[PDB]
Design a protein around this ligand. Structure first.
Ligand code: 7EI
Ligand code: 7EI
Lengths: 227, 228
């Protein structure tokens, strides 16, 4: 697997190159404001197509079976959208930048508040772009890995592979921090701080999901991967 | 924040709650109602001990009573779950709810969450999770799970304090791993592996919570237990 042979700098470059664009909502500026869920749904749907193509470019992801790729996307898709949102909003305190033309302030609200808090935490930590892309790849590979159903040798090999790629991303995070001049103690503290925010992202995804053809099915994701 | 890694570990080990028994001799086999009855009774008794444990986690009682309650509100089910997973580590294919309530997957059909718990227990076994590591992780859940959902200078001071204590627990985890002879690379990889499982514990708590709704200790109950 090429993935396992990457240096930290190569991993970062691959992830940066794979980044999807920031999409715009279909809000027509020449028409009055007088649907929020309509705009968000349309935006998320377009984002999903880009997510699939991004996932295929995350080192190690295409080494997995199509089935395992789908399972990872099924578990991670909303967390991935959410972490993208929080990243885009980092420099807009008190606001969520769903798209450059869909920037919402606080004044539904429960999940909004949680997203704002995550954005504030990212700001307070001075989260870097190189760190963000590592975290988003971790979500992809980690969120679904504990819930594989198969007992086959192949499934065991798949989980081992995922954990080895995750290990490489950890190494990458640490390398970035070391190059930035953090002491060994600071490197381990910051790694922990970043990974603990993943627990909050999960929580938000679960709450978002309960706040509810909405979720992409296994079959839809499989078709999108094969296409 | 004055504690060394060794002192932190000792404090956490000394704080550990007891393992409780489920009510003695239920009618078996179980109904849906009677199984949920037994588990509820066990969890309710466990909660009292959890509060006592929480008060002994370094840094926890430095917080306002209000902030202590909020942390427990967010973390209580995850804490119960990680305790269950720990107890079950040496019983492959089974969940050791209590020494007298050991259930295999064949028993209890809600099976989705059962399977997730079993998978976590398998992951802990495969990693050879150590007791010293377990207690660090449980304390992280307590301090981390509610911290992102805390404007006054006092609240900023509270969150900063929590993050400083969390930093100390990370240092403690690393110290343990270094003493065990892991290379620096191994230490960071294992730390990440352990912290990523916490995301799965959250997921399980959220799913468990939705299942309990298809429940929570009240603010008042938690406050009373803390004050008592
Ligand atoms: C009435 O107005 C609202 C608006 C939003 C909210 N929410 C809370 C908050 F406002 F954000 F605070 S929310 O409910 O939490 C929502 C935000 C986040 O979680 C949900 C979501 C999302 C995803 C897909 C989707 O529809 C896609 C359906 N299709 C996908 C498969 C194929 C076909 C179906 C709609 C929403 C998210 C998301 C999307 C894109 C993004 O960039 C970032 C985050 C509440 C009320
Ligand atoms: C009909 O049979 C079942 C049995 C279990 C399940 N679940 C899945 C699984 F089997 F475990 F796999 S589950 O629903 O996910 C359940 C497992 C875990 O999560 C929940 C639970 C729990 C906690 C508190 C509670 O009641 C608390 C009520 N009081 C709180 C204070 C104020 C008063 C109210 C009931 C259940 C658990 C738990 C308890 C103690 C422990 O040590 C570790 C884990 C489904 C159906």
């Amino acid at each position: 697997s090429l993935a396992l042979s990457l240096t930290a700098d190569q991993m970062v470059s691959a992830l940066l190159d794979a980044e999807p664009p920031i999409l715009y909502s279909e809000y027509d500026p020449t028409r009055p404001f007088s649907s929020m869920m309509g705009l968000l749904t349309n935006l998320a749907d377009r984002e999903l197509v880009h997510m699939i193509n991004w996932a295929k470019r995350v080192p190690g992801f295409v080494d997995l079976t199509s089935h395992d790729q789908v399972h990872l996307l099924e578990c991670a898709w909303l967390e991935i959208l959410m972490i993208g949102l929080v990243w885009r909003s980092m420099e807009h305190p008190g606001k969520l930048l769903f798209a450059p033309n869909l920037l919402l302030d606080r004044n539904m609200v429960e999940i909004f508040d949680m997203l704002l808090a995550t954005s504030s935490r990212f700001r307070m930590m001075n989260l870097q772009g190189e760190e963000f892309v590592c975290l988003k790849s971790i979500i992809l590979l980690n969120s679904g890995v504990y819930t594989f159903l198969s007992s086959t040798l192949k499934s065991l090999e798949e989980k081992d592979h995922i954990h080895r790629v995750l290990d490489k991303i950890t190494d990458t995070l640490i390398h970035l921090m070391a190059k930035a001049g953090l002491t060994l103690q600071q490197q381990h503290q910051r790694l922990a701080q970043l990974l603990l925010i993943l627990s909050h992202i999960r929580h938000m995804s679960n709450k978002g999901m309960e706040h509810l053809n909405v979720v992409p099915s296994y079959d839809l994701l499989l078709e999108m991967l094969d296409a």
